[PDB]
Amino acid sequence: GIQISGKGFMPISIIEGDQHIKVIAWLPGVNKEDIILNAVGDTLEIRAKRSPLMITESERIIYSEIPEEEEIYRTIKLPATVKEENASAKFENGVLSVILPKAESSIKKGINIE
Amino acid sequence: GIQISGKGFMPISIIEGDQHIKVIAWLPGVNKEDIILNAVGDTLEIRAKRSPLMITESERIIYSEIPEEEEIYRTIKLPATVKEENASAKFENGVLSVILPKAESSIKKGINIE
Amino acid sequence: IQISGKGFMPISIIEGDQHIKVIAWLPGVNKEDIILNAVGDTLEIRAKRSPLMITESERIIYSEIPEEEEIYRTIKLPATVKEENASAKFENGVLSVILPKAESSIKKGINIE
Amino acid sequence: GIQISGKGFMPISIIEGDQHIKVIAWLPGVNKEDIILNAVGDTLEIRAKRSPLMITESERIIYSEIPEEEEIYRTIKLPATVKEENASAKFENGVLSVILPKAESSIKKGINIE
Amino acid sequence: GIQISGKGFMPISIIEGDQHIKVIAWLPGVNKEDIILNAVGDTLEIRAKRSPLMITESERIIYSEIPEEEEIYRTIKLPATVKEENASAKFENGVLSVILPKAESSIKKGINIE
Amino acid sequence: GIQISGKGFMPISIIEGDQHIKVIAWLPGVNKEDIILNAVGDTLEIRAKRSPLMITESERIIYSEIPEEEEIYRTIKLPATVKEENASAKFENGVLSVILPKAESSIKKGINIE
Amino acid sequence: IQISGKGFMPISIIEGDQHIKVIAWLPGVNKEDIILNAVGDTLEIRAKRSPLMITESERIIYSEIPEEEEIYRTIKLPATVKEENASAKFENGVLSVILPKAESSIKKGINIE
Amino acid sequence: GIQISGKGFMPISIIEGDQHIKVIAWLPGVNKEDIILNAVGDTLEIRAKRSPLMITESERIIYSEIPEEEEIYRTIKLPATVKEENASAKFENGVLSVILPKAESSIKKGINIE
Amino acid sequence: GIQISGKGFMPISIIEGDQHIKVIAWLPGVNKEDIILNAVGDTLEIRAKRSPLMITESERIIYSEIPEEEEIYRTIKLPATVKEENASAKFENGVLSVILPKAESSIKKGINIE
Amino acid sequence: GIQISGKGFMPISIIEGDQHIKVIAWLPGVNKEDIILNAVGDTLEIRAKRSPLMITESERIIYSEIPEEEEIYRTIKLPATVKEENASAKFENGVLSVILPKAESSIKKGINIE
Amino acid sequence: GIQISGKGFMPISIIEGDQHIKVIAWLPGVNKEDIILNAVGDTLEIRAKRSPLMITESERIIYSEIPEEEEIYRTIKLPATVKEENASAKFENGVLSVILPKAESSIKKGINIE
Amino acid sequence: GIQISGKGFMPISIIEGDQHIKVIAWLPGVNKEDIILNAVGDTLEIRAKRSPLMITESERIIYSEIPEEEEIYRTIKLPATVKEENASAKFENGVLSVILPKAESSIKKGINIE
Amino acid sequence: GIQISGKGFMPISIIEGDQHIKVIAWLPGVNKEDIILNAVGDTLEIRAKRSPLMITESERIIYSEIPEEEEIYRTIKLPATVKEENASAKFENGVLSVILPKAESSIKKGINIE
Amino acid sequence: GIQISGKGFMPISIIEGDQHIKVIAWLPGVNKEDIILNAVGDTLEIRAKRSPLMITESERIIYSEIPEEEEIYRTIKLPATVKEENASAKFENGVLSVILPKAESSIKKGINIE
Amino acid sequence: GIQISGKGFMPISIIEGDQHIKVIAWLPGVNKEDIILNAVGDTLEIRAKRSPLMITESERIIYSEIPEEEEIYRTIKLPATVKEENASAKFENGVLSVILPKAESSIKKGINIE
Amino acid sequence: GIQISGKGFMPISIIEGDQHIKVIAWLPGVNKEDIILNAVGDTLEIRAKRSPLMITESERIIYSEIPEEEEIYRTIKLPATVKEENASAKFENGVLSVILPKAESSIKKGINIE
Amino acid sequence: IQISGKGFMPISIIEGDQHIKVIAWLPGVNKEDIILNAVGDTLEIRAKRSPLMITESERIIYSEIPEEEEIYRTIKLPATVKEENASAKFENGVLSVILPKAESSIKKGINIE
């Protein structure tokens, strides 16, 4: 039970362990400082500014596969409530990766097969 | 992650801040005192009655783009739990605006990108 | 009986024997931002409505509300009118104009014998 | 430039002589005194009430091809301006007939084929 | 179990009481004397002549919603056998109304709910 | 309220008077004596046999719009019960005509429009 | 082998070695209301059939029977014929014409050796 | 030969024995005294009003699979003529049940297979 | 002139003579004693049970064109009223054949073509 | 704000006031003692058995609009948590009506429009 | 491996035991002595004429769900070779039933599940 | 202007020399003496009987791609008039071959290209 | 269970007796000597050469319904194994006919109906 | 409220009592020790590998209705929160069965119908 | 080279080596003793009963992907004749695996590529 | 009457003589020793493995019409039983050719056309 | 990167830094029946493959095998090449050509600072 929603290209992946959740996000062309990242309960929010390709007035864009929007964001409802305060994150090479330990109440417990 | 539902034409907008939600509602031709408004948890209700164009018996309606219903309403499920008791509201020029501070358990905490 | 112009603005048009009422929805517009003129059989309504103002902390996460700031309507009525005696009031987002008909446009009875 | 418009079943025909226009209108079930008829210039208006089939509480309508609306009307733009003040009209057998003499400015004059 | 059939515009309605049947018929533009009306058992027949709009040779029909046919008729099979001989009828304002008391064998009798 | 049914091409017409029914039937190429015809109540039957074009063995049919069947028949349910015993009939030029006086219980009585 | 004209009139066309028979349905027509001529390879049939006559007491409540009073057919045959020796009989609504073939149109044997 | 017809949701079932017809009818929400039930020959009529769900002005209908109409009725033509005067009926728990003994003339008599 | 209706596969044919109707019914795999057969007026009823193919628990049905229903029936409305009391019937080889003499009132009488 | 789900025909309506929810259920032909009714939190369960129309072996069902299932049920999720212990319910005339007072935590509080 | 093929309506069913095949066949209207039945290897043939419904020249077929063909036949390839010489057969009530013991080489031998 | 017409499967080919026309025709299964062949002007006629495959009452036709018609014929309009009296024809191996010398009036003469 | 396959127009028929199989083949325009014919078990092979219409260089083919292929053949799998060595064949008039007595193992044996 | 989701063929069934949920799951080809099973709140997870059909290099798979994937899993959101720590489970014959007692807060309490 | 056929869900795979065929069958929820397994020539038969999920009358099936049939079977025709007597079989974990050594006459012998 | 089946691109041709079958197979890029080939009865098998285009890590495939699979195979059911032990085979230039003499029981014997 | 010509002949095209390999399926063709030339950026392959030879006793009863005897391909490559140092081998129905790139077509590095 997960829902993404927001504006602008931003490919997400979601990885679930027994005791945590990893979220991965593509943000090519974004500055680490331009990225806000907050969470609580079962929701994670990612906000990003990417400034546009700056062209001198000599230059023209004669071809482009690259999205224009400068404001981009995603709100992600995850399969488990998490501990925001132990959440880590790094940002290398256009890729954001967030680690979100699960709250105890959301950690599943085994059932033996007899 | 939002749900609107009820009877009547009533264009809604929803604005999220870090610590509040604003809801805006179009209600042309309604009287401030004919509006009821309550909330709790993560749900807002707006009720309204707008009386119909009153024609003398000499006059006929020869053309109307204007909805007829006299009972109108909306129930709105917001993306955060709120503090009803600090909610304020205004009604100017056919437009209702409601401010609803977020409850502390719904306020999101930062994660640092190291 | 032709409407035409830019922007969301629900009109209704009422006819009496001696006048035309025109009603218009203009939620979110300020009385002083509305221009209103007329002559012969045509009525013009122009309005500006400024956009919902957001602090830089806030985002719009959902909107059914039109964005255009310039809105107008030209309305050709089923009778010539007297502009000079035309009245108008603006309550609660609703504009109502009253437009007495010109004498030349007032219909006279025929008897069914 | 013959434009009919209004509400209600009401079949009109329109007959043009050199010096007049005849409008014929079906209004079965209407009382002569419940009919308003006015004109000016090149427009004719016909307004009528027809009260509904009267049923005692014993009776039921088990079949009907007969329109139910009580308010019925028509505005008709003619192909010539007329002299309202000389217009006549009878109402026999559910049929209204209106005679509308043409204004002089609207009476066509001949061209000789030499 | 009712069947209309015949030629020409003639909107019928049918009303049923415990002890009778009313039939209503629109016949704008028809002369009372031009209408034959007979019945037996469970069938009613209505025959009508309406003569055409008569135009002088100056005049032209430049527009018409009004049916042309001069012979019009309807045969109506009703939900009950009736007493023709006690049948009444009046014709006002383009509308024929026929009253047709039910035969005794066709009058339903109540059933008590215990 | 009519039903035809049976085998073969046989164009039927039906004429109603106040006191009779006439039925007309096309039967090209049939012999008056090869026709059976009976009635009772409100049903007429027509039976007929038409022998086929007889070709010598030198001759071939190189084109035919003409039905082939030799047995042909029709059962016709009329809108009134009849007196069989006063029924007459004629057969001229491929056309059969039958006159069938109505029984007294099927003859319709007038209603006066007051 | 072309048919053409106005009105319901089922034709059949039979060929012998030495003649053409033409058959035609004309129910409700009077022998004397039928004109019949021919030449070379063409046959014409014209007929009038008067309408079903109704007293003013009677109504037609159902009809599968064509209404046209003028009916005709022009038929181009697969051989030239001798008009002058053409015969014809009219029984029971059915017209039958016999049309001997012209000599120039009679086919001669070829032997299969 | 089995025709239903009239206004309103009202699921009928029909049951034939050798010597009677049973009609069953769903009429949830209806009052025993609000039901009229009469019959003659081979027809049964059922009439019933059901008053609408009543709401205080605090309350709103937020959802509803339940038809709204208040006047509801059924005319039923049965496969047999019956004896009205011996017809009984019960109304328990939303369900009307009607027992209609067949008339003698309508009771089928056996044929032996030899 | 005919209506069949009921449950089950059971091909009927219907034969009309001057003085009787013959009904024929396919009923393969039914037992002569399992057949009930009654009639009155213009309606015949055939009822039949056929028991299912009997399999031992060793055996499986590996292919089957043969209907499964065990209750089968037809109610037939004929083109004439009949004399039930003089009706005979035979059951050979899966085929039921019923002979139903017409009642006098339903026998057609000749009309002479002069 | 609502989800219904389960097996069987069983029209529900749902009414919301300020302080309670009313659920209404069509259940014609069910017995008050055959109805089980429980609730907790924001979910109501209705279970019901209705036994089938009872036919003697003389009798056949010749026509039926009436569902056959005998096990019927609904699980309903309401727009508010409720107080199960103060819930009442009535079963008249095939109609079940349940009253479910809202829990305090689910009651909405007013906001003033200044 | 199960192929039917031939002329005429003839509903087959096929039944397998461990040690035989049963073929069942519908042949209503057929005479025991008009049926030929032979077999070898894994094929069975069934041939049968049924003479047509016989009508006096007074009588007409007015209706008929019953196939007309007189020659009817079935070739059936079975899932097993059989012993023709021990095959039996009965013909009661329209139904042919054939019992075909399997040949030894075709009888399956068990495998134990260890 | 090459027109073929008649009944029956009979493939024709047509070959044109300077001074003749060859017609070839398939007629497998036909006896040379059952073929009639005549011509005049620009038309050739071919008539043939082929009697059907002869089956003893032991045998059955279990498959067939071979046309059944016994009467077969063709009329052929050629692109030139011919001299019937000098026409020859053989019939070998189911194939008829006809040689038809061209009439002098139909023999083309050369044009020199200068 | 029969399969044809091969190249070129060659209409086949297949006739089956109790003790043999007849195959018939159309081969207009083929020389008896140009036809090879072999068989074994349950398959028959037919090979044929037909040489093309030979045209002098004066002549043109201006129209043709006649297949061109010179090599034609069919392999036919029959419903029974046969005795090749007792197989006869004749070839008259473009038609090949082959007689193929059945092998004893393929001759079916009767089953008595008791 | 009942959501399945994940990789692989694995037919689930879900069973509710008053005081528990039973989950059943098909897992043919899987080893008891290759199955992981955990739960908390209202979610159950099932994970399982099944190794693939093993073929020697002589052998080939010539046909296969059997899915190939080796990793298979199911996340299931149930209609009730449960008590993980008392959940049991058996795995016989391809079938996993899990018993999940409901938590007290989720057990529905009865309402009396007065 | 293969035909499966029978009743029920039961995924088969088929493995061919040089000297045997392996058949694999999904049969989750079946009991080893409820499985019958025979073979001969080139055909294998698997028969199985599986009893239905057992519910107490407290419990309801609220969701189910799991087939219901209790009788399930497959008849399989293999690409080789086999030695039934040396066939083995195992049933673990819902999976049946049968090993079927090829008969000598069905074992392929090498051909050398020179 | 032929069946091919297996994995991979491998264009097959089949040539029949009176006394043999030749099979030709395209196998570009396969090594003579990587080909297995066996036969018996009326079935031929061809197995082959072709290793993939081997690219150094500087090189990329920028375009390929060439199938990728490394395992390829074909099983071929021929129209005659063969003598495996006299089968020969060749493999030149990517093309395999196999000669397979027919067994004596599959060699067809002549029929004389008398 | 354009292919064009007559006949079934699956090509693949491999690029290195310094050369282009071209592979081509030509089952049933004789090494000596293959012509192979090139220049600048274009490669041509022509081949004849003679048809499956049948004795007059034998018939082809089924064939998935193309019949055309003339087959060819013209291939325009993504670089100009050195024809003179082009090699080529033909094993097992498969033709493989190696075509070193011309100097003017060899790409040079750019550094990412």
Numbering used by the authors:
A (entry chain D), B (entry chain C), D (entry chain B), E (entry chain D), F (entry chain C), H (entry chain H), ...: 34 to 147
C (entry chain A), G (entry chain A), Q (entry chain A): 35 to 147
Sentences copied from the publication:
The small heat-shock protein (sHSP) class of protein chaperone is an energy-independent class of chaperone that act as holdases when combating the potential of misfolded or damaged proteins to form aggregates. sHSPs are also assembly chaperones, associating with protein polymers, such as actin, microtubules and intermediate filaments to modulate both their oligomerization and their assemblies in cells. HSP16.5 from Methanocaldococcus jannaschii (MjHSP16.5) was the first sHSP to be structurally characterized by crystallography. The protein oligomerizes into a particle containing 24 identical subunits with octahedral symmetry. The crystal structure confirmed earlier protein structure predictions regarding a central α-crystallin domain (ACD) forming a β-strand sandwich comprised eight β-strands (numbered 2–9) organized in an immunoglobulin-like fold that is flanked by the N- and C-terminal domains that dock onto hydrophobic sites on the β4/β8 edge of this β-strand sandwich at the fourfold symmetry axis of the oligomer.
In this study, we analyse the effect of deleting the IXI motif and substitute the highly conserved arginine (R107) equivalent to the disease-causing mutation in CRYAB (R120G) into MjHSP16.5. The R107G MjHSP16.5 crystallizes in the same rhombohedral space group with eight independent molecules per asymmetric unit as the WT protein. Owing to the high diffraction data quality, the mutation is unambiguously confirmed even in the initial electron density map calculated with the molecular replacement solution using the WT structure. The negative electron density on all eight independent protein chains confirms the absence of side chain atoms. Clearly, the mutation does not cause any significant change in oligomeric state and overall structure. Closer comparison between the higher resolution WT structure presented here and the R107G MjHSP16.5 shows that there are no significant changes in the main chain positions. The root-mean-square deviation of 6299 equivalent main chain atoms is only 0.45 Å—clearly within the accuracy of the crystal structure determination. However, it is noteworthy that the R107 in WT MjHSP16.5 forms hydrogen bonds to the main chain carbonyl oxygen atoms of G41 and M43, and forms electrostatic interactions with the residue E98 of the partner chain. Although the R107G substitution does not affect the overall crystal structure of the protein in the crystal environment, the loss of these two H-bonds and the inter-molecular electrostatic interaction in the R107G MjHSP16.5 variant may very well change the dynamic behaviour in solution. Each monomer has to adapt the conformation of its ACD loop to make appropriate interactions with the adjacent dimer.
